[PDB]
Amino acid sequence: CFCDHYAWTQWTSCSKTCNSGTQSRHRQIVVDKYYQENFCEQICSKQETRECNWQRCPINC
Ligand SMILES: *[C@@H]1O[C@@H](C)[C@@H](O)[C@@H](O[C@@H]2O[C@H](CO)[C@@H](O)[C@H](O)[C@H]2O)[C@@H]1O
Ligand SMILES: *[C@H]1O[C@H](CO)[C@@H](O)[C@H](O)[C@@H]1O
Ligand SMILES: *[C@H]1O[C@H](CO)[C@@H](O)[C@H](O)[C@@H]1O
Structural domain 1-58, CATH architecture: Single Sheet (2.20)
Instruction: Output the CA 36–ligand 2 centroid distance in Å.
Output: 21
d(CA 48, CA 41): 16
Instruction: From the CA of 25, give the closest atom in ligand 3.
Output: 1
d(CA 24, CA 21): 11
Instruction: Output the CA 60–ligand 1 centroid distance in Å.
Output: 11
What is the domain partition of the chain in residue ranges? 1-58
Contacts 24+ apart (CB under 8 A), 51-54: 51/20, 51/22, 52/14, 52/15, 52/16, 52/20, 52/21, 52/22, 52/23, 53/14, 53/16, 53/17, 53/18, 53/19, 53/20, 53/21, 54/20
Q: Tell me how the structure was determined.
A: X-ray
Phi, psi of 3 (to 5 degrees): -75, -25
d(CA 61, CA 54): 21
Look up residue 16 and give its amino acid. K
d(CA 46, CA 50): 14
SS3 42: helix
Q: What is the rounded end-to-end Cα distance, in angstroms, of the chain?
A: 56
